[PDB]
Every structure is written in C-alpha cells, then in structure tokens.
Design a binder for this molecule. Structure first.
Ligand SMILES: [Mg+2]
Ligand SMILES: [Mg+2]
Ligand SMILES: [Mg+2]
Ligand SMILES: [Mg+2]
Ligand SMILES: [Mg+2]
Ligand SMILES: [Mg+2]
Ligand SMILES: [Mg+2]
Ligand SMILES: [Mg+2]
Ligand SMILES: [Mg+2]
Ligand SMILES: [Mg+2]
Ligand SMILES: [Mg+2]
Ligand SMILES: [Mg+2]
Ligand SMILES: [Mg+2]
Ligand SMILES: [Mg+2]
Ligand SMILES: [Mg+2]
Ligand SMILES: [Mg+2]
Ligand SMILES: [Mg+2]
Ligand SMILES: [Mg+2]
Ligand SMILES: [Mg+2]
Ligand SMILES: [Mg+2]
Ligand SMILES: [Mg+2]
Ligand SMILES: [Mg+2]
Ligand SMILES: [Mg+2]
Ligand SMILES: [Mg+2]
Ligand SMILES: [Mg+2]
Ligand SMILES: [Mg+2]
Ligand SMILES: [Mg+2]
Ligand SMILES: [Mg+2]
Ligand SMILES: [Mg+2]
Ligand SMILES: [Mg+2]
Ligand SMILES: [Mg+2]
Ligand SMILES: [Mg+2]
Ligand SMILES: [Mg+2]
Ligand SMILES: [Mg+2]
Ligand SMILES: [Mg+2]
Lengths: 260, 155, 188, 167, 131
RNA sequence: GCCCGUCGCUAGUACCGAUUGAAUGGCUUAGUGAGGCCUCAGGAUCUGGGA
RNA sequence: GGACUUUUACUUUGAAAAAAUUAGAGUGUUCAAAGCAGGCGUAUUGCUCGAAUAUAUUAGCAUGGAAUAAUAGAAUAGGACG
RNA sequence: UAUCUGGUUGAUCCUGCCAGUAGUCAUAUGCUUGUCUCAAAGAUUAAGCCAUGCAUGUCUAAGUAUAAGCAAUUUAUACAGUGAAACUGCGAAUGGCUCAUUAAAUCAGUUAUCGUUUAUUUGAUAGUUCCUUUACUACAUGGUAUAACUGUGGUAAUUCUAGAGCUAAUACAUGCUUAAAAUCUCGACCCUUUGGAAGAGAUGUAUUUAUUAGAUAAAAAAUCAAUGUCUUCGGACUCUUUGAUGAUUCAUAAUAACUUUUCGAAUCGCAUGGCCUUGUGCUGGCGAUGGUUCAUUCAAAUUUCUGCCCUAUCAACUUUCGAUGGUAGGAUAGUGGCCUACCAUGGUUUCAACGGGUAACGGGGAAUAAGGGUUCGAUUCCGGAGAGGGAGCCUGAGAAACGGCUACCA
C-alpha cells in the first residue's frame, strides 16, 4: 500500500521486547540498519525499558544527543537505531559496556561485559562473493563489508571483528562439534556444540544440537550461530548459559532459593 | 514435442552466445551447450545428442528449476512442447472424518529431450513463469508406455 | 495507460474475472519506439525508480561486429531487409532486435586489407611481417566475401533500440547467414 | 483582469493547461498543473490596461518617466560579478569593491556590505588540498592491502606444496 | 487503535429458574454467610465449576504426566493457601469433591465473625464495608 | 353422533393477466467521442545544431 | 564424487512458525474484572525474582515406523543377474 | 460442563411439532437507577449529502540573508549575532477512516525470484576526466537568470497574477586534475636472421553489442595452424594458477568497439598549527553535506502447494475483439498472451466446469460449554480495497495519490 510504512502498532511489535499492552498504542519502529526489524532492540527500548535510565522517550533523545551512548564504537544518535545480536552498547559516562546476546526464553538480556571484551565483536558470515576488480569480500549477519578475508573463510563461519578498526582477526569454521548459539525459532537462546547437519539439497539444511546437559534439539542451519569450542566460547555467555530447564525445573530452582 | 525441420521458424533458432566460427573447420557443425539441472536429475542423453533448440528446456535452455518438485500422470499431450498432467489426491473433511477424491491439472513444458505419451507418470520441476499458465517443466519420466508392445497381434 | 496485469484476460478455465482494484502504475506498459533510420533522435524516458531508458526513434549509425574476426566497427545502417516477427517492419524499414539489416562494409573493408594485405573480392617492413604471419587464416568465406563487392553486409540487430537507444548487431555468418540468404531470395 | 500570454495569438480568452516555468501561473506543488483562463496576446478594446515599454525616447520629456530616475536596489554579490560590474581582472581584489549601504539607528549610522560568494579564499584551498590528499592517500593504502593479499596467497600456495611434498 | 482492555464475567445462572429445592438451599447459604445476592452464590458455584473442570481434565492424563504434575500441584497449593483444601486430602480428588461452603468459609465476612469481633454475619458485613 | 362439496358474507395472502406494463443495478454491440500521455509537425522568443 | 532408484495413503516425533484472544504458572490491583507487575534492605547514594507453559490440526517441510489399503513387476520371455 | 416440562385421548402408549426453559462481545426498546473500577459507541438503512473550524508541514556550528528587520556590542571594511519573507533540500505514498466492490479473487499457512525495482539506515567503494601531447587549457575556483524585495498595475471575486527594475546557491548550466608501472596494437630505422628495435598512441568507471576465460569424472600420446618462457642450440617446458550453488551463459575478469557520455566534490562548519630556500610559499586538524558501484536494512512486485458460503428451476464452458500453446519482437523494473505479428488447435468440466445468488472484504478470532457440532466475524492486530462515480496522469525512491492535478458523468 503506496510506500514504506513508518509506524509500528504496539502488539505488532516483537514480543521479546517485553513491551506492555496499554500506555499507548504504538511501539518504536526500528530504524533501517544493520539488523532486521524483527530481530533487534532499538536504543529507546534498551536505554529505557531495560536499563531504566530514562523515563520519558523524550529523555532518551536528550541522553543520546549528548553522545553518551555508542554502538560498536561509533556514536549513534537514532532513538530507534536497530541494535541487535552481537553488538556492543557502551555508556561513556558510567564506564559501562554491554553485549546484545540472547536469554533462554529468547529475549535480549542486559549483560554487562568487560572494558576490553567490549573492543571486538563476533559476526556470522552470511555470504562471500567476488566483488569488483577481483577483490573478494565477506558479509556478516550485521551487514559489514570486509574486503580481502581468508580464503578458508566461507558462509556459516563466525568471525572475530576488531570494531576499533574494520578488520577480521580470527574465524571459526562450521565443523561438527563447535559451540553454537541459536538465533531464532523456539530454541532461540539455547547453546550446544553441534552433533551433525542434515544436508537437503534444495532448501533448509537442518542442524542437530546438543548442549552441556546432554539434551538435544534441531533448528534450521540459517538459525545457527557459531561461537566457539566445547567449553571455550569466544564471548561471555549470560548466566544460565542457555541450558533451558523445564518449568518444573525452573519452579524448583526459584522455590529452593527462598530462605530470606 | 518438436520433431523434424528444427530450423522451421521465421527466425533462426540458435542457442544464444554459442558462436561456431566458420573459419575454424569443425566436425560437428553446431557446438551445443547443456547443463545438469541439479537435484540429481540425469540430463538425458537425447538432450546432449540432440539438435532441437527449445530455450525453455531444463537441460539445454535458459530456464532454471527451483521450488516445488511434483509428480503426476499425463492426461493431455495435444499441445506442442507442453503437456497437461493430473495431480490426484484425497482431501480430508473433518466433520465426517473422511476424505473425498479431488484433482488438479497442472500445465507443464516438455522438452523434446523427452518422449511423453498419455498415461506416462512424470516428475516435473517448478520454474519461472514460462507462459500464461505453465509454471512447471517435465524433468523425468518415471514411466515408459505401460506395456504397449505386449499388445501385439496373434500367435 | 497500457496495463500488463493478468487480471483482465480470462482464467485458464475460460471464466470471466471481475475487476478488483484499479490500474496500478507498477503494472504499466508504454508504447513502442518503432525506431526508424536516419539522423540521431533519441528521447530518454523516466522508468521506475530513477533509471532512464533511452527510446531511439530514427538511428543512422550502429556498432556492428564481425564475430569471426573479433572486431567491431561503427557503420551506417543501410536498410532493413528481413524481419521474422512482422513484414511491416521491413517495408517501413523499422529497427528492432532480430531485424536483418545491411550496413556498409567499407569499414570492415578498410580494416581487413590493412590487417591482412589481401583485399576482398575480385610495402612497409613490419607490415609484411605481420601480413605474412597471418594468412592460412585470410580465407574469409565465399558468402561473406561476395557481399563486399556490393559494399553492403547482412547483419542481425542484437540490441534493443527502444530500450537502450543503441542499434547494434553482428554480421551474418556461416550457418545463420545461409538461413536468411535462402529466405531472402526464395521470397524475392 | 485575466492577463495576456505571449504567443497565443488570438484577441480572445482561452483556457490553457499551464506548467512550471510559464507565465500567468505559479504552481502550488511539485509537478502540478492547473487549467486556467488566459487572455490572448492581441490587443482589443476589452483590455483594461495595455502594458508598454519605451524603446526610443521621442522629441519631448514625459514627466514621471524621463524626468525621474530610480536606482537599482541591489548590487553585485558574487565574486566575478563585482569584477564585471567594475572590470577589474583577477588581480585587483574584490573586498573593497563590494558595495556598501549606509543606514542609521537614530544616532548610530551603520554600514552593511553583502557577502562575496565564490570568493577564492585560504580556507577553500585547504579543502582542495585535503580532497586530493585523501584521494591519493587512500589509493596507496588500497594497493597495500591488495599486495598484502597477494602474499597471503603466495605463501598459502607454497603451503599446499609444502603439504604436497610431506606425503 | 489500542489494546482491547479485556474482561470476563464472574458468575453463572442456574439452568432451571424455579426449582423450589435449590431455592431453599440457596437462601440458607445467604442466611448463613450474610450474602445479599443469589449472585454471590452464583459467583462461587461458577468458580467451583471450572476448578472441577480443571481437575477433571487433569485427572484423565496419566499419573505423573508433566502438565498434570505442574498444573496439579499449582491448583492444590493455591487452594490450601486460602484454607479451602484440607492438608490431608491435598491431592485433588478432593478438589474434585469440594463444595460451595468450603469456599464460603473463607470470606473476610466470615472470618471477621468466626473469631468473635462481630457476633453476627450481618454486623460482620457492616463493619467491613464501613472501613 | 360424526361429516363432505357447491352456493352466500367479511377479511387477508399469493397466483394468472391487456398494458410488447414500469423501476433499479451489472455487464455490453454499434455510433459519437473529452482528456492526459506518446508521436509527426509547428516556431510567439532566446541563445549557442539546441532550447 | 560417480553411477541408479516403482508409485502412494496412514501414523510417529520434529522443525518453521505474530501479538492481543484462549487454556494456564507466578505476583495479595485493599477484593475483583484487570495489569505485568513486583519483591528486599544499609529505606545516605542498592539488593534482586520476573515478564513462563500450552494449543497452534488442513497443506508444505523434516524424521522414525512397515500392520492396515492401494500401485507397479516375468508369459509370444523384448525377463534377471556376469 | 451428559436433566428437560406444558399441549392431540374417555383413558393409553407412540409419532410429531408448537409452547416453555437457559446463554449470547447481540442489537433495539420500556420501566427503574445510589457508589468504585473498566469504557463500546452513525457498522447494519443511504461507499447517501454535507455549513463552518481544524486534521502537513519542516532548519542544524554546518546550502542561500544588503529585510530599506531586530539587536547592539565587541575585534572583525567582503561575510560573521539573531532572523520575517523567499530560494534550495526533505516530507506530504506514513497516519487516520471506511467495508462499496471482490467467490479461485482476496485472504491464511507454505513457497519462488537462477524473474525484478528499491529513497533511506548501516558497511564497503573512485590517483586515470584535457590534447596531435614546447611557445597552452580560468584551478588562487569559469557562466547567467530568478524568487523574496523595490516600483507600476488589472478583476465583483480565490492560496489569480501581469509589465518594469534588482540579486544568491549544495537551485540552474558548465568545466580543469594526480604516482609508478605493466600489457597491448601501430611502427622510424638494420638484416637477413632464429630474427630487434628506439618512440608513437591507446587502456578510470558507467553505457551497448560481439567475442573469450570462469577448469576438475581417474589417466596418457601423435599431428595442423598460429606462438609463449628458459638454451648446456639436438632441444626441452619442470613446479604450473583457480570462488560460490542442488543447478546457470553465476560472481568476477579479458579482447574489438559503441555513447546527443553516467559518475569521478567549482560545496559548507569549527578549530588554526606546523614547516624553510620567509614566497602570506608548501603543508595540515576534527566532521557536515554530497557522490558512483556493491552490500545491508525498511520495502515493493510478482509467485508455488492446498484451502471458501448458497445454487442444476445453471451442463457444458472458453477463442466478438487471446481462448490454450510454439517462434520473434515490442513493451516492463523485470517473468508472462502483457501486447503485436506469424503459426497451431488447443484450455476447463458430474472429483460440478461455466453461469446465478450473497442482506460476502479475508484472516487472527467471537457466541454456545459432555463429545461430535452449530452460528457469527462492518468493527481495537495483520492483509486487501476505496476516497461521490469512472478514466487519465504529473511529481517522485515509492501514488495510477484524490485533505495532487486533468476530463467526462452525477
Ligand atoms: Mg522510527
Ligand atoms: Mg532457498
Ligand atoms: Mg497446438
Ligand atoms: Mg508510437
Ligand atoms: Mg559559496
Ligand atoms: Mg505435529
Ligand atoms: Mg504466549
Ligand atoms: Mg386441548
Ligand atoms: Mg382433554
Ligand atoms: Mg366419557
Ligand atoms: Mg422454542
Ligand atoms: Mg454508512
Ligand atoms: Mg463503526
Ligand atoms: Mg545580517
Ligand atoms: Mg494507509
Ligand atoms: Mg538564460
Ligand atoms: Mg545538483
Ligand atoms: Mg583447459
Ligand atoms: Mg571453480
Ligand atoms: Mg555476466
Ligand atoms: Mg598560517
Ligand atoms: Mg433462479
Ligand atoms: Mg509467445
Ligand atoms: Mg477451435
Ligand atoms: Mg453439485
Ligand atoms: Mg458487501
Ligand atoms: Mg474483518
Ligand atoms: Mg464470513
Ligand atoms: Mg456492510
Ligand atoms: Mg488508494
Ligand atoms: Mg460520501
Ligand atoms: Mg463504463
Ligand atoms: Mg485517484
Ligand atoms: Mg477529506
Ligand atoms: Mg490521503
């Protein structure tokens, strides 16, 4: 219908935002950017709804316009800037670094990270073509163009990225038995090594995952984000380490912790 | 369907950008191009041995098979270079807890690398809009004729 | 204006479809360039999203290439002489792709003789080297050599003049030339 | 009160489609044309007013016209235009040839000259200096990272021939 | 364009409008707990009704089924919590039994009377509604 | 005892029916055909073949 | 990587899967319909649990099963293996 | 949350309907009406008609200020604060409303783009622009023609505007530039060989065409035509370079040319410093706005499989004037009968085609509670469609737009 849509009705907004039903009628529509709409956390939601640092939306603009807040290094002054998985939100005041990395319920958790882990990010390479003048390039789930990468690097591999400068300092091949973060589906936020991948020529390679609790499950290869080695990840994982416990399991953990 | 003539049109039939240099004396006249459509569909030898042109051929032409792969039994071969198959199936009506016979006819392009007749079961592959109605291309005959030569004369 | 929807047009059953919605501009079609010969006259046309298309109406020169010699020259376009789609294109000398034309030869002459040192139909140092280097290669082809006497070469337009403002093509050669030669006279 | 329109001919009115950049019409919106009445360009007795320009001054003076002379409101503001409304050669320096309009604040008589544009200035050359400098600087860097990749492949090849000599 | 503010009703009417026996049995409840409406009884018998449905539904799944154990325990503990369900018969075939007066016995109305402090179900009302 | 139909009253409904009856809405032949768009020309004026 | 494969129905588990609605957990909106809150202290400079789960079927996908019901095969041998 | 009761008889048992009974996010109306919270609401009939007001405008240090504007102070004799008007840029294609049309359409779930367009956001990305190439081309920066304004006017009347006179740019229109090198074709001369050469041009990107590379399914040889690098002068060639996909004529590159030639910064804000042969030389900081190509993101457009209410008192339908396919073109953003030519005779149907009806927008959903079902969904979210009716189109990345224009009808 006639052109780009500019609004987002509350209720149409993604759920893992934990937006609330009333108090309005719209939600912030994520700017065009590095991450898809429906898999992002816009700056307004994070500064206000998570960190509680502003109350008003109007205050969130006042905060950003001082250039306090910088994503992946750069300063970012877009109330609805589409922040998303693997990024690094930083508050110059309050000396505070974060990474956007998933819960186990499938939500973006607040996750405080070190001042120096904050100087690089991970990126799944999504494609690698041969660009203009013979110069080969890789492109990462967060839309970064990196020229002259390792030949050995190909699609579905993850890649450590300088932030400080553009470049790739390391990569991890997609091999049977590599630490995997699950970015999508119901199994979103789970973490678990890899068993083996169903091929299926024509569409939708499946990837069989097993975590550190010898529980198993499957997703589409598309939904698989390599992040390291058995034991050894390459970023600090948020508490609970994406293991996913039964409702009964979680009930008990929560009603075992009680002796005030 | 095609058969005979090959150069039978007002325009000259040729595979595009497949130059044969008249200067260079060759023993085959026409240099031919082909591919394997993929998904494990044997590009039959009649498409390589052939001389027909059909740009809408999955092995010799500039179509591409991607998407749905379907089977059905041939019910109409009256159209030049395209057939019509019937895909039958049973459709489940919950209230009665029973199914009824239904069917659909899908029209599909058939390259003169195949020789199809009515009753042949045929595996077709989805391709780009190739005509007003045809969105599929015959990609393998899982048939033969249904024992025709076992209908010859007397002893 | 011209629509390219399928939503007119009976369904494959033959059924008559109601009108749902009006003409959108993204299914639009525009009119034919119907380009002719002579004195450069092209009109840009603003097509979806910026993107110019060039509508040639009247062209006199195009860039034509002799494939087997791997060169390309810019010649006059003499005339249209055969067209598989519609004869009115031939009779009104209309340029479109597929059209069979005649061009000039004298640029493809001036190249040949200056490169082979042989001349069609009927003293420098390095030249003699290069000329003698070539040949056993200068053999051309009868049905193409003949045309030079006439000073006009048969060629098949390969560009889309109504689209790109270019009227380009290749010389006719060997197999495909024989095809039109037969059609030419066995219709003449 | 409908206006004439040069080149309609006719000594009557008509209704035309008018566009941007055309007399008797000021478009209210991007790519808008309004269909408006217009009077012809041929003088008839219906005209309330005939617009006229003097081209040769006859043998006598017309009071409020030849006898009075009204000054041109604005003066030259672009660099070379001052240079041409005085004829100066790119040597003479404009800044003192810009025009100066006095005015009073009751007991403060002021002075306000334009703002010469397309003036060549030190600032501007620093930006020209900078552009070129960046262009070339990049250019070399881009060769480097290129040649760096040649190496990354050259001693990768001689690792597939140190591998192809192990077995 | 807003979120539908959701509601639902909290009572249910009797099928048969004039059943002399249900009628007596109903008033007697009011007389005993100081209600003003048959609705106040309708309200509860409806609550009761669904609880039983929840309990029935759960009871048809196999013993030690995950939902059953989770949703079963949850139901029971909540009932205990307000003191409707007996500590002993804490296993939901008595939530299946149960009955209206077990619910009535826990209204503030009724507690504010039970340990004196009102000495009448009605004086109990008046005191409560009067801050 | 029951009870059937013509015939007679009041009231209501639907049918048939001269009027080649009427009205609304959807398509649509043939004829006439606005307007913009494209196109062959045009050239008030206004510059360096173009506007 | 090559070289080839009788067709299906049924059923199992699973992916891919909007939110509000519904079913349903946790939380004493004073109750409740609701809401997704809230709860703790050093109440002078913070501590912390949450924001589940289920259903989501007909079709398409992916996998296990081989009963039930179809289909095809070798009889003018133009059969099968080498 | 698995219940029935009244009514045919003299009485009886049945069949069977009418009546009762209960719910309705289901409307109306009547009577009655005190408190907290919650809060639907001109859908239904008339997508009937509308007085008046309002609902789209927008400025940062950072495109344009001689307001004959305000401010004055505080350094500014080109400008500098602030700033109406106006130009320029961006937006007005979102939103909100409504449910008329629409029955294989929409819509849902599920696919496809190896079938395309994509402002913007984000990330990459540009040493090549001139010219027979020593008496040279503005680069220390090339052209005017306009608003606002000033003044003269016209009409009963409008967001009507005319004649005159000015003047800006990130508006309009132009137009210079930069290393080394390598490879190509020409080739003045010299000499016979097996043969080699000064030096002359050409080569950014984009456009259009033609040609070529883009290997790999396990291994080897001979000969023709051209012709590479290394001589231990019969000869050898030894290491020999390769991206992605299920799949491509893919990504990318190479050759010959083509172009009323796309882009390659004549822009702006803050700082003002290094550096000597003391030229105001040569350099040089932070970041704005631009800019081609690619990627990304917001999109769009088409698209595969299956699924719709009643109807035979609709059985055959489709090709007048495309109906179903083939070839070629044209047109499009692009596939495609989309359109045109030529050619063919196809396409659908009792497994219900085609036609008719719908007091029909589809979906999420809603009401009724043993289960199976029945009925409803104009209407808070998603999709679609419209703006009194039809058609046309301008602008633009995006409209076949209606709080845009043009025409006809009312
Ligand atoms: Mg926004
Ligand atoms: Mg795919
Ligand atoms: Mg046919
Ligand atoms: Mg025309
Ligand atoms: Mg300037
Ligand atoms: Mg299932
Ligand atoms: Mg939920
Ligand atoms: Mg009676
Ligand atoms: Mg009786
Ligand atoms: Mg009696
Ligand atoms: Mg009843
Ligand atoms: Mg209405
Ligand atoms: Mg309404
Ligand atoms: Mg001023
Ligand atoms: Mg809208
Ligand atoms: Mg001018
Ligand atoms: Mg410009
Ligand atoms: Mg080879
Ligand atoms: Mg390869
Ligand atoms: Mg290509
Ligand atoms: Mg200085
Ligand atoms: Mg009827
Ligand atoms: Mg065709
Ligand atoms: Mg026929
Ligand atoms: Mg029927
Ligand atoms: Mg309707
Ligand atoms: Mg609806
Ligand atoms: Mg309905
Ligand atoms: Mg309605
Ligand atoms: Mg519309
Ligand atoms: Mg109206
Ligand atoms: Mg009409
Ligand atoms: Mg309109
Ligand atoms: Mg309005
Ligand atoms: Mg509007």
């Amino acid at each position: 219908a006639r052109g780009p849509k500019k609004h987002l009705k509350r209720l149409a907004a993604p759920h893992h935002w934990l937006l609330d039903k009333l108090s309005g009628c719209y939600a912030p529509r994520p700017s065009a950017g590095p991450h898809k709409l429906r898999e992002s956390l816009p700056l307004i939601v994070f500064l206000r709804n998570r960190l509680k640092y502003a109350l008003n939306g109007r205050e969130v603009k006042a905060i950003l316009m001082q250039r306090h807040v910088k994503v992946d290094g750069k300063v970012r002054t877009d109330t609805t800037y589409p922040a998303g998985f693997m990024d690094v939100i930083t508050l110059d005041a309050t000396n505070e670094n974060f990474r956007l990395v998933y819960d186990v319920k499938g939500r973006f958790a607040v996750h405080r990270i070190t001042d120096e882990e904050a100087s690089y990010k991970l990126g799944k390479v999504k494609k690698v073509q041969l660009g203009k003048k013979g110069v080969p390039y890789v492109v990462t789930h967060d839309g970064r163009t990196i020229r002259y990468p390792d030949p050995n690097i190909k699609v579905n591999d993850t890649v450590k990225i300088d932030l400080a400068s553009g470049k790739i300092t390391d990569f991890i091949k997609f091999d049977a038995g590599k630490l995997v973060y699950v970015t999508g589906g119901r199994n979103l936020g789970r973490i678990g090594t890899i068993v083996h991948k169903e091929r299926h020529d024509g569409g939708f390679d499946l990837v069989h995952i097993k975590d550190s609790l010898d529980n198993t499950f499957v997703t589409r290869l598309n939904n698989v984000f390599v992040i390291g080695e058995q034991g050894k990840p390459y970023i600090s994982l948020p508490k609970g380490k994406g293991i996913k416990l039964s409702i009964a399991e979680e009930r008990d953990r929560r009603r075992a912790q009680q002796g005030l | 369907s095609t058969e005979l003539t090959v150069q039978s049109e007002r325009a000259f039939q040729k595979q595009p950008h497949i130059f044969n240099n008249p200067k260079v004396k060759t023993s085959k006249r026409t240099k031919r191009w082909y591919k394997n459509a993929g998904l494990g569909f044997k590009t039959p030898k009649t498409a390589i041995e052939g001389s027909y042109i059909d740009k809408k051929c999955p092995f010799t032409g500039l179509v591409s098979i991607r998407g749905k792969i379907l089977t059905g039994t041939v019910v109409s071969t009256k159209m030049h270079r395209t057939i019509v198959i019937r895909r039958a199936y049973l459709h489940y009506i919950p209230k009665y807890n029973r199914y009824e016979k239904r069917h659909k006819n899908v029209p599909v392009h058939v390259s003169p690398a195949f020789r199809v007749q009515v009753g042949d079961i045929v595996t077709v592959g989805q391709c780009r809009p190739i005509s007003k109605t045809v969105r599929f291309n015959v990609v393998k005959v899982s048939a033969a004729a249904a024992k025709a030569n076992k209908q010859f004369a007397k002893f | 204006g011209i629509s390219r929807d399928s939503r007119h047009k009976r369904s494959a059953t033959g059924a008559k479809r109601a009108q749902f919605r009006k003409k959108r501009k993204f299914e639009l079609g525009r009119q034919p360039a119907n380009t002719k010969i002579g004195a450069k006259r092209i009109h840009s046309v603003r097509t979806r999203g910026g993107n110019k298309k060039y509508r040639a109406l009247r062209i006199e020169t195009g860039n034509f290439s002799w494939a087997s010699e791997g060169i390309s020259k810019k010649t006059r376009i003499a005339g249209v002489v055969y067209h598989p789609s519609n004869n009115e294109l031939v009779r009104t000398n209309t340029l479109t792709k597929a059209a069979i034309v005649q061009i000039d030869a004298t640029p493809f002459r001036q190249w040949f003789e200056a490169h082979y040192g042989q001349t069609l139909g009927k003293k420098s140092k390095n030249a003699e080297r290069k000329w003698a280097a070539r040949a056993a290669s200068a053999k051309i082809e009868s049905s193409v050599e003949s045309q030079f006497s006439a000073g006009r070469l048969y060629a098949c337009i390969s560009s889309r003049p109504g689209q790109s403002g270019r009227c380009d093509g290749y010389i006719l050669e060997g197999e495909e030339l024989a095809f039109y030669l037969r059609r030419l006279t066995a219709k003449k | 009160g409908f206006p004439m329109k040069q080149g309609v001919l006719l000594p009557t009115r008509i209704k035309l489609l008018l566009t941007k950049n055309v007399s008797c019409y000021r478009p209210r919106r991007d790519g808008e044309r309004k269909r408006k009445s217009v009077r012809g360009a041929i003088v008839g007795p219906d005209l309330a007013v005939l617009a006229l320009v003097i081209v040769k001054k006859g043998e006598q003076e017309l009071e409020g016209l030849t006898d009075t002379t009204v000054p041109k409101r604005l003066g030259p503001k672009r660099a070379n235009n001052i240079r041409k409304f005085f004829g100066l050669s790119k040597e003479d320096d404009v800044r003192d040839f810009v025009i100066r309009r006095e005015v009073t604040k009751g007991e403060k008589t002021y002075t306000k000259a334009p703002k010469i544009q397309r003036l060549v200035t030190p600032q501007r050359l620093q930006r020209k200096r900078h552009q070129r400098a960046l262009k070339v600087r990049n250019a070399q860097a881009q060769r480097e990272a290129a040649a760096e990749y040649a190496q990354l492949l050259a001693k990768r090849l001689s690792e597939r021939k140190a591998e192809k000599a192990e077995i | 364009p807003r979120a539908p503010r959701t509601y639902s009703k909290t009572y249910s009417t009797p099928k048969r409008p004039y059943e002399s026996s249900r009628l007596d049995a109903e008033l007697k409840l009011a007389g005993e707990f100081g209600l003003k409406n048959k609705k106040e009884i309708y309200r509860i018998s409806f609550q009761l009704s669904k609880i039983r449905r929840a309990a029935r539904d759960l009871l048809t799944r196999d013993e030690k089924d995950p939902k059953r154990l989770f949703e079963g325990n949850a139901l029971i503990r909540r009932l205990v919590r307000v003191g409707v369900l007996s500590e002993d018969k804490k296993k939901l075939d008595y939530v299946l039994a149960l009955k209206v007066e077990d619910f009535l016995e826990r209204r503030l109305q009724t507690q504010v009377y039970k340990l004196g402090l009102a000495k009448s179900v009605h004086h109990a009302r008046v005191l409560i509604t009067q801050r």
